[PDB]
Amino acid sequence: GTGETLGEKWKARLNQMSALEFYSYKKSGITEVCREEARRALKDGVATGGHAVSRGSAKLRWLVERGYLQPYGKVIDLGCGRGGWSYYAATIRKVQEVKGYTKGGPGHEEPMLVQSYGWNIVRLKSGVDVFHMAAEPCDTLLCDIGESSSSPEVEEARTLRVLSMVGDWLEKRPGAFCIKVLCPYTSTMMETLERLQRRYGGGLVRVPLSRNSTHEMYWVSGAKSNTIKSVSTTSQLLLGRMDGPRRPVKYEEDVNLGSGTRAV
Ligand SMILES: C[S@@+](CC[C@H](N)C(=O)[O-])C[C@H]1O[C@@H](n2cnc3c(N)ncnc32)[C@H](O)[C@@H]1O
Ligand SMILES: [Cl-]
């Protein structure tokens, strides 16, 4: 083999940054949705204003509007948290049912109950560890699990744990999927992702709403990405942002998910 990858170099540089450098680096040049209004409304109990429950709805919007993902049918959302991906999925015409599962509890996000469009086809279940749930068939499989660590070895071990669990769900044959890959950047991870692409298809995409402090990419059924090239391009973007001036954030309006129930 050839030793340290570009993403491993990125992680080592990230760990050596001072806190002041990290503070400016983490958002340099990223895209960000404005959330102050949504958070205030949600704090006020507004359920019909179209507000997204988290920044996650915008991440899924980015993938869907570009054709990386075409959700349909029964959607299962593993690690749904407050529900940003589940509520976004429920607004999509071809989606018919959304079931989110999340752990909840101290230090973890609980599902939030709002009345964005299609809320009546969404069921969010807390108190569920998806690593100990039997996999079920679905049409679209979503998973946004993976806890960051300063150790790249820990990030790799955590990502392999996520992907092994997701493989049990992929074996039930959904036609669409979107899976967070916390660590795509070690040699073991790139080999694993190539194997997974051969069996299940799809490819990796970097969402520009991700912060520069994580190398996360999304494995989606509609990408046709060379694993090594897509990971390397992302490592180069993240490394390049470690040099030179702070780049401005590209602010965007957050997703508005509307209101009202869906008919059947
Ligand atoms: C990145 S957040 C997901 C955000 C979500 N996609 C959204 O748009 O709001 C990942 C969620 O997975 C949950 N989680 C982590 N491990 C879990 C597990 N083993 N079982 C179920 N949920 C888990 C975390 O508590 C967290 O709320
Ligand atoms: Cl997580």
Author numbering: 3 to 266
Kindly provide excerpts from the paper associated with this entry.
The flavivirus genome consists of an ~11 kB positive-sense single-stranded RNA that acquires a methylated 5′ cap structure (N7MeGpppA2′OMe; Me, methyl group) for stability, efficient translation, and evasion of the host immune response. The NS5-MTase methylates first the N7 atom of guanosine and then the 2′O of the initiating adenosine of the nascent viral transcript (GpppA-RNA →N7MeGpppA-RNA→N7MeGpppA2′OMe-RNA) using S-adenosylmethionine (SAM) as the methyl donor and generating S-adenosylhomocysteine (SAH) as the reaction byproduct.
Purified protein was crystallized at 20°C, and the structure was determined by molecular replacement. The SAM adenine base is sandwiched between the Lys105 (partially disordered) and Ile147 side chains, whereas the N1 and N6 atoms makes hydrogen bond with the backbone amide of Val132 and side chain of Asp131. Asp146 is part of the K61-D146-K182-E218 tetrad motif that has been shown to be important for both N7 and 2′O methylation.
